[PDB]
Coordinates of C-alpha atoms and ligand atoms in Angstrom, one line a residue:
X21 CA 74.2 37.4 283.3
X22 CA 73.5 40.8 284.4
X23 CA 72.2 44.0 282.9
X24 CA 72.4 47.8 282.6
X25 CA 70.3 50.7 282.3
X26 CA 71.4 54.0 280.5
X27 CA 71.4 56.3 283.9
X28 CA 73.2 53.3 285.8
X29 CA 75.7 53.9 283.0
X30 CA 75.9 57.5 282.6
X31 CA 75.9 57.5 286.4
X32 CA 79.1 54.9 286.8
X33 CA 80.6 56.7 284.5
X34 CA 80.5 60.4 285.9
X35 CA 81.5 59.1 289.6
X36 CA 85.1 58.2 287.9
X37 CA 85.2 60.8 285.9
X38 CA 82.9 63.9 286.7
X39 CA 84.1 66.3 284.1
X40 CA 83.7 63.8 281.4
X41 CA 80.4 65.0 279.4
X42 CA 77.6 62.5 277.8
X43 CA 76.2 64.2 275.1
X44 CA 74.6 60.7 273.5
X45 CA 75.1 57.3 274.4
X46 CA 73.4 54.2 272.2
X47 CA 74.0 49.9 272.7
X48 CA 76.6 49.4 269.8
X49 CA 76.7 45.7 270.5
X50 CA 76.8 43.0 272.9
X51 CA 78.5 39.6 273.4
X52 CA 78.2 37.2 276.0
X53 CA 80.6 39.0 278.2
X54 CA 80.0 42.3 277.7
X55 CA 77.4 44.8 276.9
X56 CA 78.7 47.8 275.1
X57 CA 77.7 51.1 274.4
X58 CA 79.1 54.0 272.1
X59 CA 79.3 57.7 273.7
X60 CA 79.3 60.6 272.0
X61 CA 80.2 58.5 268.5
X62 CA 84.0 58.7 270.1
X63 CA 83.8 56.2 272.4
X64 CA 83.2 52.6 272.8
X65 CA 82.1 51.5 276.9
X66 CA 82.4 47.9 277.6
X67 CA 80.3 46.8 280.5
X68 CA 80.8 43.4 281.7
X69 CA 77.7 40.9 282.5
X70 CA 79.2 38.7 285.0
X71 CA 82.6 38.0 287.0
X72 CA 84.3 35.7 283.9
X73 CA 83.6 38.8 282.0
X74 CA 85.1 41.4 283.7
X75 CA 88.1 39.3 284.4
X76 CA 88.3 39.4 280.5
X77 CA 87.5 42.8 280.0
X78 CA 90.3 44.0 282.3
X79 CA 92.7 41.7 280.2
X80 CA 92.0 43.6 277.4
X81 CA 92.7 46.6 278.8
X82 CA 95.7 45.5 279.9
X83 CA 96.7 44.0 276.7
X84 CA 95.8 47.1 274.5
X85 CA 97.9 49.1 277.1
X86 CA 100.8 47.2 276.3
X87 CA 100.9 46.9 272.7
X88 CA 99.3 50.5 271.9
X89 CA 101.5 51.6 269.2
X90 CA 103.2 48.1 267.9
X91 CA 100.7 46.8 264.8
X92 CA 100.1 48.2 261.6
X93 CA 96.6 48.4 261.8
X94 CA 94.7 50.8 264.0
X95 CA 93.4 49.4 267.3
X96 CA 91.4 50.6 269.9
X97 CA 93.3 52.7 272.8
X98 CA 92.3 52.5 276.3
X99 CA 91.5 55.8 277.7
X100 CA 88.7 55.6 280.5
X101 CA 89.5 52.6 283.2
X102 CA 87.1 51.6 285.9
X103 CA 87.6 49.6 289.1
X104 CA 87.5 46.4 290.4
X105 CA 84.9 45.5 293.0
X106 CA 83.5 42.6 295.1
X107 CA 83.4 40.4 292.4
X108 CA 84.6 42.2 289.4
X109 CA 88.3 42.9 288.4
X110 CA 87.0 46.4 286.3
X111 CA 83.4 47.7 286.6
X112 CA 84.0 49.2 282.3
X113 CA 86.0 50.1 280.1
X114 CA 86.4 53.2 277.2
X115 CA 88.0 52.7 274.8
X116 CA 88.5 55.1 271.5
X117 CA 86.1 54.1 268.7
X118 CA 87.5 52.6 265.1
X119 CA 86.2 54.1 261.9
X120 CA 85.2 51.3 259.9
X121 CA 82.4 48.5 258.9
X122 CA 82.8 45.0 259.6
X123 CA 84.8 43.1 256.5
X124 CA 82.0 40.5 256.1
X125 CA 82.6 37.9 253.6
X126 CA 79.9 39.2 251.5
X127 CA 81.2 42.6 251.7
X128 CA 84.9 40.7 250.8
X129 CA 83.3 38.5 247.8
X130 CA 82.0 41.8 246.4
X131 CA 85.4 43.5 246.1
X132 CA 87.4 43.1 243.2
X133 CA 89.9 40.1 243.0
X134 CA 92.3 42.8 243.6
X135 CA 91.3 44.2 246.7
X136 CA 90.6 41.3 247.9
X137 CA 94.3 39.9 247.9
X138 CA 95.6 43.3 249.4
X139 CA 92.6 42.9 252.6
X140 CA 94.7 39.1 252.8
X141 CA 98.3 40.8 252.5
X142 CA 97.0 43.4 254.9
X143 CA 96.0 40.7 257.5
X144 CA 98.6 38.7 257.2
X145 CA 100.8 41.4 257.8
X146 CA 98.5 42.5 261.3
X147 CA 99.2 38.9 262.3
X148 CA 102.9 38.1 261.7
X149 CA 103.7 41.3 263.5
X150 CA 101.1 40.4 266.4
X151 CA 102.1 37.0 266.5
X152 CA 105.9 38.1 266.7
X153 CA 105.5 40.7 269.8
X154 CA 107.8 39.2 272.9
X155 CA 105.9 37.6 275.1
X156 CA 108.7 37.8 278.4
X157 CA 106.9 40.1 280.8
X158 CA 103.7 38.1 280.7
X159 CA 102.3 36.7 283.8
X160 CA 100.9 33.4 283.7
X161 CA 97.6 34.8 284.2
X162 CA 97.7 36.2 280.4
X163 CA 98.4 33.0 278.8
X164 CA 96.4 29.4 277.6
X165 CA 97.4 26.1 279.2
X166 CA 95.8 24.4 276.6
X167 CA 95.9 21.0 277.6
X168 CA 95.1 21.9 281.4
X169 CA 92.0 23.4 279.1
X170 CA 90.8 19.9 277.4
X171 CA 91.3 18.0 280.8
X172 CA 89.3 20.7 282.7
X173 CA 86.4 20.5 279.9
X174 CA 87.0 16.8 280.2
X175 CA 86.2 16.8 283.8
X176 CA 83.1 19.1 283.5
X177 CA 81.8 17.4 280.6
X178 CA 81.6 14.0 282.8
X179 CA 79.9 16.3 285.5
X180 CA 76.7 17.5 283.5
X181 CA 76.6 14.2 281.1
X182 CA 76.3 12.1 283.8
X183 CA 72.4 11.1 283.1
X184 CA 72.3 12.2 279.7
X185 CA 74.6 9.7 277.9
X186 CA 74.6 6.0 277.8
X187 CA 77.8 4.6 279.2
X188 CA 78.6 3.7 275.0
X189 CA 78.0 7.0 274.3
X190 CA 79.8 8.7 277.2
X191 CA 82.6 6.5 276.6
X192 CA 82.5 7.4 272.6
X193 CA 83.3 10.7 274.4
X194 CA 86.2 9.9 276.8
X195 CA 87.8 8.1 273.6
X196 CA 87.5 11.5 271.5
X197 CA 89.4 13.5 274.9
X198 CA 91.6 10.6 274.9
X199 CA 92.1 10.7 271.1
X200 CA 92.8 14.9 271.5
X201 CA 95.2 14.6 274.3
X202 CA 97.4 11.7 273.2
X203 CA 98.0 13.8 269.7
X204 CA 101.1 15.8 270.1
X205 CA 100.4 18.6 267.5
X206 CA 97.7 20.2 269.5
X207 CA 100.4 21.1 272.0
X208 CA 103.5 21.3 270.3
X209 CA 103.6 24.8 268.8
X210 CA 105.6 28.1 269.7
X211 CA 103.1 30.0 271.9
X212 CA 102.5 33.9 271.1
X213 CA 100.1 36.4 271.4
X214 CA 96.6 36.0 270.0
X215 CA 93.9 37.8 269.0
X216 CA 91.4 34.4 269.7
X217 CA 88.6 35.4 268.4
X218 CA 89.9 36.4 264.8
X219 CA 87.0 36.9 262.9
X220 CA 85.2 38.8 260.0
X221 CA 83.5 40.6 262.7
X222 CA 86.2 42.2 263.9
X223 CA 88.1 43.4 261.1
X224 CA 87.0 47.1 259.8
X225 CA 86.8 48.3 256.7
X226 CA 86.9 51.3 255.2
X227 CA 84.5 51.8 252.0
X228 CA 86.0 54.6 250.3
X229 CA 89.7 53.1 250.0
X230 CA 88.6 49.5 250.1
X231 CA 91.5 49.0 252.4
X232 CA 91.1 47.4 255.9
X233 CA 91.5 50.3 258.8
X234 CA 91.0 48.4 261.9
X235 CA 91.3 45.6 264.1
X236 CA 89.0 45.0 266.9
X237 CA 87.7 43.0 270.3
X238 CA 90.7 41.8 272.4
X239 CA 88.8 40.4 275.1
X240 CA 89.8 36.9 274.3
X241 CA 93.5 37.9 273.7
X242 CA 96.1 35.6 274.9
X243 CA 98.9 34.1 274.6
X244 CA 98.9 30.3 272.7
X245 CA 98.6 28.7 269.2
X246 CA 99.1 31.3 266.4
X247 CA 97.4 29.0 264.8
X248 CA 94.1 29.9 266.4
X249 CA 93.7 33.2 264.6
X250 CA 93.5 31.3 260.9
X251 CA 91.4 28.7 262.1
X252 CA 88.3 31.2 263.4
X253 CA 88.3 32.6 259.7
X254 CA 88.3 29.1 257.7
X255 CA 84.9 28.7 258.2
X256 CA 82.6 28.7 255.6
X257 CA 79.5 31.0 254.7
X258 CA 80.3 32.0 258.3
X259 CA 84.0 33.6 257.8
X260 CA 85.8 33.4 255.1
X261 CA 86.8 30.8 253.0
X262 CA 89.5 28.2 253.3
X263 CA 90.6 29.3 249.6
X264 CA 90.8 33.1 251.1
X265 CA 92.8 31.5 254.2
X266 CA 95.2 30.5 252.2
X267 CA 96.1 33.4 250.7
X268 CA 96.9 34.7 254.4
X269 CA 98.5 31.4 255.2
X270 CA 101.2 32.2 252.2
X271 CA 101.9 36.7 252.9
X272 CA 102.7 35.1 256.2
X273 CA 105.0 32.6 255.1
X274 CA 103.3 29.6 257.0
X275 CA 105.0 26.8 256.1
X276 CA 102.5 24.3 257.5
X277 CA 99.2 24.5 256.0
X278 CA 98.2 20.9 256.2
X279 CA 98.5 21.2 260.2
X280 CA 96.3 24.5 260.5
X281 CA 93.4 22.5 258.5
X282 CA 93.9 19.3 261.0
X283 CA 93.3 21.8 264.1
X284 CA 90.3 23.2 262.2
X285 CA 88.5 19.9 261.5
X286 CA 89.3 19.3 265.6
X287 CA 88.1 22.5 266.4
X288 CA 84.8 22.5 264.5
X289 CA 84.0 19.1 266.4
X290 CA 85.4 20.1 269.6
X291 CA 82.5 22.9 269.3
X292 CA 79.5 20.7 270.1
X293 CA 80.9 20.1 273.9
X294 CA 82.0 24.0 274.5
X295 CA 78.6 24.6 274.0
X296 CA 77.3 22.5 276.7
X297 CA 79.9 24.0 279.2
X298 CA 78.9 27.5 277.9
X299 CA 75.2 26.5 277.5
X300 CA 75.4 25.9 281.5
X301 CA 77.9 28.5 282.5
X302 CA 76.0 31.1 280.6
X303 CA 72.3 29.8 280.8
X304 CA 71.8 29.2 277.1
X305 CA 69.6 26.3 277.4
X306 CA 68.8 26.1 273.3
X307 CA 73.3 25.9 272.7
X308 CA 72.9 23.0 275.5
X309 CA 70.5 21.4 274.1
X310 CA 71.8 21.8 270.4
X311 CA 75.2 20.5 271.5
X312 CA 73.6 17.1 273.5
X313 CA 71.9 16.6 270.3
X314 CA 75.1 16.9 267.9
X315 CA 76.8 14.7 270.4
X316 CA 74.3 11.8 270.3
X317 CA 74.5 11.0 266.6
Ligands
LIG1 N1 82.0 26.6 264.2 C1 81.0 27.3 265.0 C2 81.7 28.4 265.6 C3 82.8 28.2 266.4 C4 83.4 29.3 267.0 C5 82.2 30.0 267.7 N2 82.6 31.3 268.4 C6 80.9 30.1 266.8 O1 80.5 31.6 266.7 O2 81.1 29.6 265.4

């Protein structure tokens, strides 16, 4: 996990592109793989804090590249690249900035019943027509071997709970990967493009029309279970609700409800051992420790 000053910023930033001008530059946000900063108020810079980050950063920018003008919500365009090095696909990123405030469900609960249902046309509109993009021309790289996923967790999870779990406890784990990968419905869906990490957080919203004017953060884009992108809003208190889902669910025309709430209960569960794996890959001791505990009751 690596960090950034302002001039190391400015300064990677002017050697690509030396007639490009920083009048102000501010920390909009940061995740876990990037840090990123807004210049001028025009821009959004994504720096990356490690190698797994930068790989994802540069499939963002190759993702928004190739679906620039085909959703009917704004989304950010690329327009500054920077370059691979030792260890890093792409040192950053620009990218043009969105006008708009996050759609947080308290934000969506204070809207009229009205607005609300257009914000879930609106979304559900954003994600038939993301969900229907053809996915031919993309490499293998770009897309989620899902069950090559649970058996490469399952592997890693035997690694670093090897001396923390009782062999009845570490088995009441195997049965759970077991249980996961011998279920069929995981698996057996029509893959697409996905945003991944479809969340209240990422949805803008402008105020003044009380219409939703933005979609953003495609790091995690790629191509699996469309699914995936109702499941990260069901939560509750946290997202949306699975009443509000539902109204998606039906402007898209899923015809399949009951399976989208089975993935979700697996999903929420499933959670508890992504945080070890992340709690180690990243160094977050406290999600490490948090999932161990969730795990031993
Ligand atoms: N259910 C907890 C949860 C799962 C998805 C994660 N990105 C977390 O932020 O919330």
């Amino acid at each position: 996990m690596r960090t950034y000053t302002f001039d190391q910023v400015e300064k990677a930033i002017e050697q690509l592109y030396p007639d490009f001008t920083i009048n102000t530059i501010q920390i909009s946000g940061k995740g876990n793989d990037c840090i990123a900063y807004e210049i001028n108020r025009d821009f959004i810079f994504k720096f990356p804090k490690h190698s797994r980050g930068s790989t994802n950063l540069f499939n963002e920018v190759n993702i928004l590249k190739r679906i620039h003008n085909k959703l009917p919500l704004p989304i950010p365009e690329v327009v500054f690249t920077g370059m691979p090095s030792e260890t890093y696909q792409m040192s950053f990123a620009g990218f043009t900035k969105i006008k708009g405030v996050p759609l947080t469900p308290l934000l969506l609960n204070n809207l009229p019943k009205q607005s609300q249902n257009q914000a879930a046309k609106d979304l559900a509109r954003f994600l038939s027509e993301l969900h229907s993009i053809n996915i031919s021309g993309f490499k293998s790289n770009l897309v989620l071997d899902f069950r090559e996923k649970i058996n490469e967790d399952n592997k890693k999870i035997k690694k670093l709970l090897s001396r923390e779990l009782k062999g009845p406890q570490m088995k009441k784990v195997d049965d759970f990967y077991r249980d996961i990968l011998e279920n069929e419905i995981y698996f057996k869906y029509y893959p697409c493009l996905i945003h991944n990490d479809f969340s209240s957080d990422h949805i803008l919203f402008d105020t003044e029309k009380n219409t939703i004017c933005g979609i953003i953060d495609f790091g995690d884009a790629a191509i699996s279970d469309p699914d995936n992108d109702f499941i990260s809003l069901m939560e509750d208190d946290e997202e949306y609700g699975m009443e509000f889902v539902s109204k998606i669910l039906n402007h898209y025309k899923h015809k399949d409800i009951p399976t989208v709430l089975e993935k979700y209960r697996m999903k929420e569960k499933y959670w508890s051992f992504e945080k070890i794996i992340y709690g180690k890959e990243y160094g977050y001791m406290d999600w490490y420790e948090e999932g161990l505990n969730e795990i031993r009751s």
